[PDB]
Short mmCIF file of C-alpha atoms in Angstrom, two decimals:
data_model
loop_
_atom_site.label_atom_id
_atom_site.label_comp_id
_atom_site.label_asym_id
_atom_site.label_seq_id
_atom_site.Cartn_x
_atom_site.Cartn_y
_atom_site.Cartn_z
CA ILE A 1 163.73 173.53 232.21
CA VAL A 2 165.87 175.56 235.45
CA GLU A 3 168.85 177.79 235.00
CA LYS A 4 168.42 177.68 231.36
CA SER A 5 171.80 178.97 229.57
CA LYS A 6 173.23 179.99 226.07
CA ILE A 7 171.98 182.43 224.65
CA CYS A 8 173.17 182.50 220.25
CA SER A 9 175.28 185.08 219.70
CA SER A 10 174.39 188.52 218.19
CA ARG A 11 177.62 189.35 216.71
CA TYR A 12 177.06 187.64 213.36
CA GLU A 13 176.97 189.67 210.06
CA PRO A 14 177.03 187.41 207.43
CA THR A 15 177.55 188.59 203.56
CA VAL A 16 176.46 186.21 200.61
CA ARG A 17 174.85 186.66 197.99
CA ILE A 18 170.53 186.83 197.58
CA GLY A 19 169.04 185.00 194.87
CA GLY A 20 165.75 185.36 193.86
CA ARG A 21 163.38 185.80 190.88
CA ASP A 22 164.76 183.22 187.62
CA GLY A 23 167.58 182.36 189.83
CA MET A 24 169.12 186.27 189.28
CA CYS A 25 170.54 187.97 191.96
CA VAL A 26 170.17 191.63 193.94
CA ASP A 27 172.66 193.66 191.69
CA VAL A 28 173.97 197.00 192.24
CA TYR A 29 173.82 198.15 188.83
CA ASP A 30 177.86 198.58 187.00
CA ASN A 31 178.93 198.87 190.41
CA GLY A 32 177.56 201.94 190.07
CA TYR A 33 178.01 203.02 194.02
CA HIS A 34 176.54 206.99 194.33
CA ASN A 35 173.98 207.95 195.96
CA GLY A 36 170.44 207.30 194.30
CA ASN A 37 172.40 204.37 192.13
CA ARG A 38 169.77 201.61 191.13
CA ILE A 39 169.61 197.84 192.40
CA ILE A 40 168.52 195.56 189.98
CA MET A 41 168.21 191.71 188.91
CA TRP A 42 171.11 190.49 187.37
CA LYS A 43 172.85 187.36 186.15
CA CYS A 44 174.69 185.47 189.68
CA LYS A 45 177.91 186.00 188.35
CA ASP A 46 180.53 182.82 187.40
CA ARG A 47 182.79 184.75 190.87
CA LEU A 48 181.74 186.32 194.08
CA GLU A 49 182.24 190.31 193.62
CA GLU A 50 181.08 193.17 195.19
CA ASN A 51 178.46 194.62 194.01
CA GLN A 52 176.19 191.22 194.55
CA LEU A 53 178.09 190.49 197.79
CA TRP A 54 175.75 191.87 201.13
CA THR A 55 175.95 192.36 204.07
CA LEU A 56 173.04 191.80 206.45
CA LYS A 57 174.05 194.05 209.42
CA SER A 58 173.00 193.46 213.35
CA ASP A 59 171.35 197.18 212.72
CA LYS A 60 169.42 195.30 210.59
CA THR A 61 170.40 196.96 206.94
CA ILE A 62 171.36 195.42 204.00
CA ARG A 63 175.17 196.56 202.54
CA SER A 64 177.27 196.27 199.68
CA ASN A 65 180.57 198.08 199.97
CA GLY A 66 179.05 200.11 203.07
CA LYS A 67 176.52 201.29 201.10
CA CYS A 68 172.95 200.54 202.34
CA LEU A 69 170.31 199.18 200.26
CA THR A 70 167.67 202.04 200.60
CA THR A 71 163.94 202.87 199.19
CA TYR A 72 163.16 205.63 197.55
CA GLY A 73 159.91 205.62 199.19
CA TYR A 74 157.05 203.58 201.11
CA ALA A 75 154.44 203.26 198.52
CA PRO A 76 154.21 200.21 195.88
CA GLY A 77 156.20 201.02 193.27
CA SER A 78 158.78 203.12 194.72
CA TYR A 79 162.37 201.63 193.56
CA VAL A 80 165.44 200.75 195.75
CA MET A 81 168.25 201.89 195.70
CA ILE A 82 172.41 202.11 196.84
CA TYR A 83 172.40 204.88 199.17
CA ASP A 84 174.64 206.31 201.99
CA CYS A 85 173.68 204.68 205.82
CA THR A 86 173.42 207.78 207.87
CA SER A 87 171.84 210.13 204.56
CA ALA A 88 169.06 208.20 203.56
CA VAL A 89 166.00 208.54 205.91
CA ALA A 90 167.13 205.48 208.79
CA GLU A 91 163.80 203.82 208.32
CA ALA A 92 163.83 203.34 204.73
CA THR A 93 167.59 201.30 204.87
CA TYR A 94 165.94 198.84 207.25
CA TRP A 95 164.95 195.21 205.72
CA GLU A 96 163.73 191.89 207.54
CA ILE A 97 164.29 188.54 205.74
CA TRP A 98 161.99 186.27 206.76
CA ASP A 99 162.16 182.43 206.94
CA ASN A 100 160.11 182.30 204.43
CA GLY A 101 161.76 183.98 201.64
CA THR A 102 160.13 187.63 202.47
CA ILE A 103 162.25 190.63 202.61
CA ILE A 104 160.51 193.41 204.36
CA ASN A 105 160.73 197.22 205.31
CA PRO A 106 159.15 197.22 207.95
CA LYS A 107 157.79 200.85 208.76
CA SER A 108 156.63 200.60 205.11
CA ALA A 109 155.58 197.01 205.18
CA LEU A 110 156.11 196.80 201.57
CA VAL A 111 158.52 194.30 200.70
CA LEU A 112 161.76 193.69 197.29
CA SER A 113 160.33 192.48 193.97
CA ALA A 114 161.37 191.85 190.96
CA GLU A 115 158.55 192.81 188.86
CA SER A 116 160.12 192.62 185.41
CA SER A 117 161.49 189.02 184.05
CA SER A 118 164.09 190.41 182.09
CA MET A 119 167.19 190.18 183.23
CA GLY A 120 168.15 193.90 184.47
CA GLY A 121 165.39 194.91 185.24
CA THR A 122 165.00 196.90 188.53
CA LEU A 123 163.71 196.66 191.86
CA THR A 124 160.98 197.58 193.49
CA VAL A 125 159.17 198.00 196.82
CA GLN A 126 154.90 195.65 196.42
CA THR A 127 152.46 194.91 198.98
CA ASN A 128 153.06 191.00 199.79
CA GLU A 129 151.20 188.87 197.79
CA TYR A 130 153.96 186.29 198.56
CA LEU A 131 154.39 185.96 195.27
CA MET A 132 157.58 184.08 193.03
CA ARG A 133 158.72 187.05 192.16
CA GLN A 134 158.81 188.45 195.59
CA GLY A 135 160.59 185.32 197.01
CA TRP A 136 164.51 185.51 197.77
CA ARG A 137 167.36 182.99 199.45
CA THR A 138 170.76 184.25 200.97
CA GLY A 139 174.04 182.41 200.29
CA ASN A 140 177.06 182.81 198.40
CA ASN A 141 175.91 179.31 196.24
CA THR A 142 172.46 180.87 194.58
CA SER A 143 172.57 177.27 192.16
CA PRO A 144 168.94 175.78 192.50
CA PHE A 145 168.80 172.06 194.38
CA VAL A 146 167.60 169.24 191.51
CA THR A 147 165.97 166.36 193.60
CA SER A 148 162.91 163.90 192.62
CA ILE A 149 160.46 164.68 195.08
CA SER A 150 158.35 161.40 196.74
CA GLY A 151 154.91 161.54 198.62
CA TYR A 152 152.38 159.09 199.20
CA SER A 153 152.63 154.56 198.91
CA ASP A 154 156.38 156.34 198.11
CA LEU A 155 155.71 157.42 194.67
CA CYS A 156 157.25 159.81 193.54
CA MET A 157 156.17 163.07 191.38
CA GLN A 158 156.75 162.67 187.38
CA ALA A 159 156.18 165.49 184.66
CA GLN A 160 154.13 164.15 182.23
CA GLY A 161 153.74 166.89 179.51
CA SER A 162 152.09 169.63 181.60
CA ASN A 163 150.92 167.37 184.20
CA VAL A 164 152.04 166.11 187.20
CA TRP A 165 151.34 162.99 189.21
CA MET A 166 152.23 160.16 191.40
CA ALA A 167 154.06 157.11 189.38
CA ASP A 168 157.29 154.07 190.87
CA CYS A 169 160.21 156.15 192.27
CA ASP A 170 162.89 155.63 188.45
CA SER A 171 166.46 157.03 189.13
CA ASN A 172 166.25 156.98 186.02
CA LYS A 173 163.78 159.32 184.57
CA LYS A 174 164.57 162.57 184.11
CA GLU A 175 160.77 163.55 184.58
CA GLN A 176 161.34 163.00 187.76
CA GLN A 177 164.01 165.64 188.43
CA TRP A 178 162.63 169.18 189.85
CA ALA A 179 165.40 171.74 190.30
CA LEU A 180 163.99 174.33 193.27
CA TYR A 181 164.69 177.64 192.98
CA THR A 182 166.29 181.08 195.19
CA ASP A 183 162.18 181.86 194.35
CA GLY A 184 160.83 179.58 195.60
CA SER A 185 159.24 177.55 193.16
CA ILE A 186 159.64 173.89 191.27
CA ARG A 187 160.44 173.97 187.99
CA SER A 188 161.02 170.58 185.59
CA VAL A 189 164.50 170.05 184.78
CA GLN A 190 162.92 169.03 181.23
CA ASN A 191 162.53 172.29 181.26
CA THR A 192 163.18 174.90 183.46
CA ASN A 193 160.21 177.43 181.86
CA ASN A 194 157.99 175.49 183.96
CA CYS A 195 156.76 175.93 187.37
CA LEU A 196 154.43 173.56 189.50
CA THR A 197 151.18 175.53 189.84
CA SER A 198 148.27 175.79 190.96
CA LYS A 199 145.39 175.96 188.83
CA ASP A 200 142.53 178.10 191.14
CA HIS A 201 143.39 179.60 194.51
CA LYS A 202 140.47 176.87 195.72
CA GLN A 203 140.23 173.78 197.36
CA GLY A 204 140.46 170.88 195.27
CA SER A 205 142.72 173.47 192.87
CA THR A 206 144.44 170.70 190.50
CA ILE A 207 148.35 171.64 190.52
CA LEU A 208 149.95 171.64 187.00
CA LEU A 209 153.20 173.12 185.33
CA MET A 210 152.90 176.42 183.54
CA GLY A 211 154.89 178.84 182.28
CA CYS A 212 157.17 180.84 185.69
CA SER A 213 157.09 184.19 182.97
CA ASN A 214 154.29 185.37 185.11
CA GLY A 215 156.03 184.73 189.11
CA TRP A 216 152.56 184.42 190.68
CA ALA A 217 152.05 183.33 194.22
CA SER A 218 150.86 180.38 192.71
CA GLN A 219 153.72 179.18 191.69
CA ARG A 220 156.30 179.77 194.97
CA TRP A 221 156.10 177.37 197.57
CA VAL A 222 157.23 176.06 201.34
CA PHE A 223 158.92 173.27 201.97
CA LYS A 224 158.22 172.34 205.78
CA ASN A 225 159.55 170.26 208.19
CA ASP A 226 156.41 168.91 208.95
CA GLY A 227 156.41 167.54 205.02
CA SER A 228 154.47 169.75 203.51
CA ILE A 229 155.07 171.94 200.35
CA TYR A 230 153.55 174.73 201.34
CA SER A 231 151.71 177.43 199.87
CA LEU A 232 152.45 181.28 202.18
CA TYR A 233 149.06 183.19 199.73
CA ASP A 234 146.38 180.44 199.78
CA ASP A 235 146.74 178.67 203.07
CA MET A 236 146.85 175.51 201.18
CA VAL A 237 149.23 172.28 200.71
CA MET A 238 149.42 169.77 197.86
CA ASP A 239 147.20 167.04 198.71
CA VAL A 240 147.72 163.49 196.58
CA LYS A 241 144.23 163.48 195.96
CA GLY A 242 141.35 161.38 198.11
CA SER A 243 145.14 159.09 199.11
CA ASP A 244 143.99 157.91 195.81
CA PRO A 245 147.02 158.20 193.35
CA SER A 246 144.98 156.53 190.66
CA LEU A 247 143.33 159.44 190.02
CA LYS A 248 146.43 161.07 188.84
CA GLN A 249 145.52 164.45 190.49
CA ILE A 250 148.17 166.38 193.24
CA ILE A 251 145.82 169.69 194.60
CA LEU A 252 145.99 172.48 196.54
CA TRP A 253 144.20 170.79 200.33
CA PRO A 254 144.44 172.86 203.60
CA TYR A 255 146.65 170.31 205.80
CA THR A 256 145.39 168.53 208.05
CA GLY A 257 148.80 166.34 208.19
CA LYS A 258 147.37 162.67 206.51
CA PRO A 259 150.07 160.62 204.42
CA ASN A 260 149.20 162.42 201.03
CA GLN A 261 150.34 165.54 202.46
CA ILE A 262 153.63 165.05 203.19
CA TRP A 263 156.36 165.12 200.61
CA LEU A 264 160.10 163.96 201.09
CA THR A 265 162.96 165.14 198.67
CA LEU A 266 165.02 162.92 197.69
CA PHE A 267 168.06 164.50 196.67
CA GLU B 1 158.32 160.34 231.26
CA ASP B 2 158.39 156.52 228.90
CA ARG B 3 161.17 154.22 228.06
CA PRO B 4 159.82 151.44 227.06
CA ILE B 5 159.91 152.81 223.44
CA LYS B 6 160.13 149.14 221.58
CA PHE B 7 160.15 148.02 218.20
CA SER B 8 160.28 144.61 217.14
CA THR B 9 161.83 142.63 213.92
CA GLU B 10 159.16 140.38 214.48
CA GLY B 11 156.07 140.52 211.60
CA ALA B 12 157.54 144.58 211.45
CA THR B 13 155.73 146.76 208.69
CA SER B 14 157.18 150.37 206.73
CA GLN B 15 154.42 151.49 209.24
CA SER B 16 155.37 149.92 212.46
CA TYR B 17 158.76 151.61 211.86
CA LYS B 18 157.94 154.61 211.08
CA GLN B 19 154.98 154.17 214.55
CA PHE B 20 158.83 153.52 215.92
CA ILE B 21 160.42 156.16 215.00
CA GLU B 22 157.54 158.99 215.69
CA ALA B 23 157.63 157.22 219.65
CA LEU B 24 160.99 158.05 219.81
CA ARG B 25 160.72 161.81 217.34
CA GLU B 26 157.79 162.51 220.75
CA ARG B 27 160.29 161.31 223.63
CA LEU B 28 163.15 163.83 223.00
CA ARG B 29 161.92 167.15 221.50
CA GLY B 30 161.88 169.32 224.07
CA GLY B 31 161.33 172.84 222.28
CA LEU B 32 160.77 173.90 218.15
CA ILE B 33 163.60 176.49 217.20
CA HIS B 34 162.65 178.97 214.17
CA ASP B 35 160.01 176.06 213.76
CA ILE B 36 162.12 172.81 213.49
CA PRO B 37 162.35 170.02 217.18
CA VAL B 38 165.23 170.23 219.19
CA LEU B 39 167.09 168.22 221.71
CA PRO B 40 166.67 169.36 225.31
CA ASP B 41 169.42 172.00 227.19
CA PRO B 42 171.20 169.88 228.73
CA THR B 43 171.59 172.12 231.29
CA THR B 44 167.65 172.01 232.00
CA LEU B 45 167.68 168.10 233.18
CA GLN B 46 169.19 165.83 235.95
CA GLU B 47 170.22 162.52 235.32
CA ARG B 48 167.73 160.30 235.89
CA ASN B 49 165.92 162.12 232.85
CA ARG B 50 168.66 162.09 230.77
CA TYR B 51 168.34 158.63 229.46
CA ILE B 52 165.99 156.60 227.54
CA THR B 53 165.72 152.81 226.41
CA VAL B 54 165.21 151.36 223.25
CA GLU B 55 163.43 147.87 223.40
CA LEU B 56 164.27 145.94 220.56
CA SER B 57 162.97 142.57 219.63
CA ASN B 58 163.45 139.36 217.70
CA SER B 59 161.15 137.63 219.47
CA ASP B 60 159.12 138.30 222.57
CA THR B 61 162.40 135.95 224.15
CA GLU B 62 165.71 137.35 221.84
CA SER B 63 166.38 141.26 222.28
CA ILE B 64 168.14 143.49 223.26
CA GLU B 65 167.86 147.34 224.48
CA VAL B 66 170.20 150.78 224.36
CA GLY B 67 170.65 153.78 226.39
CA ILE B 68 170.07 156.20 224.42
CA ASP B 69 171.04 159.66 225.64
CA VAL B 70 167.84 162.23 225.28
CA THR B 71 170.69 165.79 225.43
CA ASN B 72 171.95 164.45 221.88
CA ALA B 73 170.38 161.54 220.32
CA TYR B 74 173.97 159.19 221.58
CA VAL B 75 173.65 155.04 221.93
CA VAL B 76 175.80 154.89 225.30
CA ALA B 77 175.23 150.95 226.50
CA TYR B 78 173.05 148.31 224.98
CA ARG B 79 171.52 145.83 226.93
CA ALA B 80 171.90 141.46 227.19
CA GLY B 81 170.12 139.76 229.48
CA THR B 82 171.89 140.90 233.40
CA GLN B 83 174.55 142.22 231.35
CA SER B 84 175.27 146.03 230.17
CA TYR B 85 177.83 147.45 227.98
CA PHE B 86 178.78 150.85 228.47
CA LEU B 87 180.75 153.08 225.61
CA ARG B 88 184.19 154.47 226.24
CA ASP B 89 182.54 157.76 226.41
CA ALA B 90 178.98 157.41 227.98
CA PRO B 91 178.73 160.04 230.27
CA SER B 92 180.26 159.26 234.20
CA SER B 93 176.46 159.07 235.51
CA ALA B 94 175.22 156.76 232.32
CA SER B 95 175.73 153.54 234.96
CA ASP B 96 174.29 154.99 237.12
CA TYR B 97 170.62 155.07 235.91
CA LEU B 98 170.79 152.85 233.10
CA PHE B 99 171.24 149.36 233.19
CA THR B 100 170.80 149.02 237.53
CA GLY B 101 170.58 145.58 238.28
CA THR B 102 172.45 144.53 235.82
CA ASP B 103 176.76 143.70 235.71
CA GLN B 104 177.94 146.29 233.52
CA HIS B 105 180.89 146.46 231.88
CA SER B 106 182.82 149.55 229.88
CA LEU B 107 183.49 148.91 226.39
CA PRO B 108 187.20 149.78 224.92
CA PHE B 109 185.99 152.19 222.42
CA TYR B 110 183.31 154.74 221.68
CA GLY B 111 180.20 155.03 219.35
CA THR B 112 181.96 157.67 217.46
CA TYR B 113 182.20 156.93 213.18
CA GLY B 114 185.48 156.35 212.85
CA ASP B 115 186.04 154.31 216.24
CA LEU B 116 183.43 152.04 215.53
CA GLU B 117 185.04 152.02 211.49
CA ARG B 118 188.27 151.36 213.09
CA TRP B 119 186.93 148.73 214.90
CA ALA B 120 184.49 146.56 212.55
CA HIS B 121 187.70 147.64 209.67
CA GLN B 122 183.79 148.41 207.29
CA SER B 123 182.53 151.98 206.66
CA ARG B 124 179.50 153.04 206.80
CA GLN B 125 179.51 153.39 203.28
CA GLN B 126 179.89 149.32 202.94
CA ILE B 127 177.68 148.08 206.12
CA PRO B 128 174.07 147.48 205.03
CA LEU B 129 171.42 148.57 206.34
CA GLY B 130 167.63 146.82 206.90
CA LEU B 131 165.74 143.75 208.71
CA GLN B 132 167.92 141.55 207.91
CA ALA B 133 171.44 143.40 209.13
CA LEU B 134 168.72 144.37 212.50
CA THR B 135 167.67 140.76 213.40
CA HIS B 136 171.52 139.82 213.49
CA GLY B 137 172.84 142.80 215.60
CA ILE B 138 170.07 141.88 217.80
CA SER B 139 170.82 137.69 217.81
CA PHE B 140 174.78 138.31 218.04
CA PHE B 141 174.51 140.76 221.49
CA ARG B 142 172.18 138.71 222.89
CA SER B 143 174.15 135.52 221.94
CA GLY B 144 176.73 136.97 223.90
CA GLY B 145 178.43 138.53 221.20
CA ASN B 146 182.21 138.71 222.54
CA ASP B 147 183.87 139.73 218.85
CA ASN B 148 184.71 143.43 219.41
CA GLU B 149 185.31 143.70 214.99
CA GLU B 150 180.96 142.57 215.32
CA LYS B 151 180.26 144.46 217.96
CA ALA B 152 181.72 147.69 216.44
CA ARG B 153 180.08 146.41 213.02
CA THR B 154 176.77 146.21 214.77
CA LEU B 155 176.15 149.51 216.75
CA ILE B 156 177.08 151.13 213.18
CA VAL B 157 173.72 149.38 212.32
CA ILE B 158 172.06 150.75 215.17
CA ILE B 159 172.84 153.78 215.38
CA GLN B 160 171.57 154.34 211.96
CA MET B 161 168.89 153.29 212.09
CA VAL B 162 167.38 154.40 215.44
CA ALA B 163 169.50 157.16 216.47
CA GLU B 164 170.28 158.73 212.94
CA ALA B 165 166.57 158.03 212.09
CA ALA B 166 165.72 160.16 214.72
CA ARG B 167 167.44 163.10 213.34
CA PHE B 168 166.44 163.17 209.63
CA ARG B 169 163.09 162.31 207.90
CA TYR B 170 165.40 161.37 204.65
CA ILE B 171 167.03 158.14 206.56
CA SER B 172 163.72 156.82 207.91
CA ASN B 173 162.08 157.40 204.53
CA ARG B 174 164.96 155.21 203.20
CA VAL B 175 165.58 152.80 206.04
CA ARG B 176 161.04 152.39 206.23
CA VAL B 177 161.65 151.93 202.09
CA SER B 178 164.41 148.87 202.86
CA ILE B 179 161.88 146.86 205.29
CA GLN B 180 159.02 147.66 202.89
CA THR B 181 161.00 146.19 199.78
CA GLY B 182 162.65 143.25 202.17
CA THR B 183 166.10 145.17 200.67
CA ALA B 184 169.22 145.91 202.61
CA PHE B 185 170.57 149.23 201.49
CA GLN B 186 174.26 150.57 201.98
CA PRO B 187 173.89 154.41 203.36
CA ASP B 188 174.71 156.94 200.02
CA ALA B 189 176.42 160.12 199.70
CA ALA B 190 173.49 162.52 201.02
CA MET B 191 173.29 159.98 204.48
CA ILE B 192 176.53 159.97 204.80
CA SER B 193 176.26 163.65 204.27
CA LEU B 194 173.59 164.29 206.33
CA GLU B 195 174.86 162.30 209.39
CA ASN B 196 178.15 163.75 209.01
CA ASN B 197 176.46 167.70 209.33
CA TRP B 198 173.95 167.30 211.96
CA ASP B 199 175.73 169.50 214.34
CA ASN B 200 176.49 172.03 211.26
CA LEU B 201 173.05 171.98 210.52
CA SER B 202 171.68 172.89 213.77
CA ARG B 203 174.12 175.53 215.32
CA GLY B 204 173.39 177.38 211.39
CA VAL B 205 169.89 177.19 211.74
CA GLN B 206 169.74 178.15 215.67
CA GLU B 207 172.56 180.76 215.06
CA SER B 208 170.61 182.23 211.94
CA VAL B 209 170.80 185.58 211.34
CA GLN B 210 168.39 186.89 209.00
CA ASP B 211 167.75 183.48 207.08
CA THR B 212 171.35 182.57 207.03
CA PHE B 213 173.42 180.35 208.32
CA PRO B 214 176.87 182.59 210.22
CA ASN B 215 178.24 179.58 208.54
CA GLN B 216 177.99 177.49 205.01
CA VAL B 217 176.33 173.63 205.28
CA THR B 218 178.71 171.24 202.38
CA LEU B 219 176.23 168.58 201.81
CA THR B 220 176.62 165.90 198.78
CA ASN B 221 173.50 164.72 196.59
CA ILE B 222 172.49 161.06 195.73
CA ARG B 223 175.15 161.55 192.35
CA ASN B 224 177.58 162.87 194.99
CA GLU B 225 177.81 166.43 194.04
CA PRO B 226 177.32 169.82 196.19
CA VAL B 227 174.58 170.63 197.99
CA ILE B 228 176.03 173.81 199.72
CA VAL B 229 172.74 175.01 202.23
CA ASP B 230 172.80 178.75 204.13
CA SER B 231 169.76 179.90 203.76
CA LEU B 232 166.42 178.91 206.39
CA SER B 233 164.41 179.54 203.30
CA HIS B 234 167.03 176.40 200.87
CA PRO B 235 164.56 173.27 200.80
CA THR B 236 167.09 171.06 201.73
CA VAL B 237 166.70 171.89 205.55
CA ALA B 238 162.62 170.15 205.83
CA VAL B 239 164.84 166.69 206.26
CA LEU B 240 165.72 167.52 209.82
CA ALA B 241 163.17 165.92 211.94
CA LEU B 242 165.03 166.73 215.46
CA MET B 243 168.09 169.54 216.16
CA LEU B 244 171.09 169.06 218.09
CA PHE B 245 170.98 171.91 220.93
CA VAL B 246 172.91 174.43 220.44
CA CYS B 247 172.22 177.97 222.25
CA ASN B 248 168.66 180.33 222.50
CA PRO B 249 168.68 182.51 220.01
CA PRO B 250 168.52 186.38 221.36
CA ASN B 251 164.54 187.60 221.08
#
C-alpha cells in the first residue's frame, strides 16, 4: 500500500427488477401510483414495464415512476406501499439491499417479505429470520440459474425422490439439475415445487427435499466464494457426511473448510 | 515474498495441481472486496514486487518458468535455459527484473487471446488442455521451440491452465478432473465466457451499488445459453476466486 488511488463512483443508480419468492417480482399494483397504493408480489411480466422497474437511488431510496417504496409503519406486519418521496417520513423510504439478498428498512430494522405464497400477495416488513420468503435478487432477468452441482470426490448432487446424496456426474440425468432461484432456494428441475431443506436446525440435521410452499429459513441458501453452501439463519453449511459419499447423506454442519464442504456450480 | 511456485507434470495428481493453484492464489491476492479476493492495486507496488515466476517441470531437468504480472495475472515472458522471451506487450519494466541472467528476447505478438489465436491458427475451443498438452508445451519451449505458430499455441494452454485457473474455481475444477481422469478437454462455452468476462465481473462486483452491478454480465452455460448476472446474490458469482482490481468502493 502507499499513495492509494481510485474510488468507485457513487453516481451509479441502476433501475432493475427485484425478484424474490417463487421467482415473483416486486410490483406496484395495477400501475397504481396514487399515494398509499399497495406493493405486491406479482408474476415477472414478459416485458419490462414501469410498475416492475425500480431505481436504486444513491440516497438509499427505491423508486418506481419517481414515487418511493415506503413502509406503512415500523412494526412486524405493516405493509409497504408506493408514496411520494418528500411527503412520507424520510426513514420509511430508506432501504438497504445486502450482499445476502436481504432488503432492510434501517430505521425499523424490519425486512421486506412476501408472506403469501399466492401471486398477488401484498408485501410487508417483518422481523428478519433469513427466511426464503425474505430473500431477493436484483436484475431485470429474474430467471433461475439451472446448473448441476458437484462436491466431494467430484460427485454431483442427485435428487432421488425426496432424498439427495452424491453420485456420478452424468450430464444426461435430469435428477442432477437444480434451479437456483431468486429467493435463494435450490429447486429440483424435476418438480420446482421442491426445495433442498434441512430437517432441523441442529448440527447433523439431514438436508433433503420438501415443498417450497412455506418459505422457511431452512430453504434459503447462499453460495459463498469459499465454496460453501451456507445457511444464513443457522450459522451452518451443507456437509457431505464424514467425507463418506457412501452414507448417502448431506447434512448441516459448521464450516471447517474441509473438502466435504466445498461445492461448485457446473453451469 | 515467494516466487518458486512450482508444479511438476511428473506423477502429478488432482491434489498436487490443486496445491499448485492454491499457492499461486495465496501469492496474488492483496485484499478482499465484498468478501472476494482481489489482486493488488497496481499503484501499491514497486516494479520489484510486480512479477513472480511459476516453474513448470516435466522432469527435474526439463521445464520452463513463466513470468506473471501480479497486477493482473497475465503471462508476460517465459524462460527456457538462459533464454527468456517477452511478449510484445509485457510492461516496460519486465526485462528489468524478470529473467535477469539470461539472453532476453522479444516475441512479436502479445498474450492476448486474439493475437495468440491469430498466430496459432486455432481457437481456444479447438486447443485441448490437460497434463498431456502441458507436458508438450514444456517440451516444445524447452527444446528451443522456435516456431511462432506453436509458441502461440502452447501459450494458450499455459495461460488457461495457470492464469485462468487461478482466477476461477470452475476452470481449476475442470483442469483438475482431466488430470484425475487422464483425459484431455476442449474448453466449453462456460469456460470461455468466464475467461472473456473476467474484467466485467470484477468491475460489477467492485462498483455494485445495492447488491447490484451498474452493468449486467452475460455469461453462457455449457448448453451455450445466456446466464445474465447483475447481482452479488446471484450464485454464479461464487466461481470467482480472484478479481482484477478496478476501484475501492467508497465507504
